[PDB]
Symmetry: C2
Subunit: 35 residues, 2 copies
Amino acid sequence: GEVEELEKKFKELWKGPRRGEIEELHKKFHELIKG
Amino acid sequence: GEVEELEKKFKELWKGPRRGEIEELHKKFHELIKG
């Protein structure tokens, strides 16, 4: 197990369950790890 | 199950397994869902 898990949960939440709440979390990830 | 799954896998990959590869994926998420 490496990072393929976080990526799969990503495209799986946009196409399946809700979506607006998912991309909202992505914005949080930008303020979570910065760049 | 809603979005708490993607968030947990997030902070779990930074603090546990590798990390540089995780934040790298986050950049991909920005080009994955745009804003």
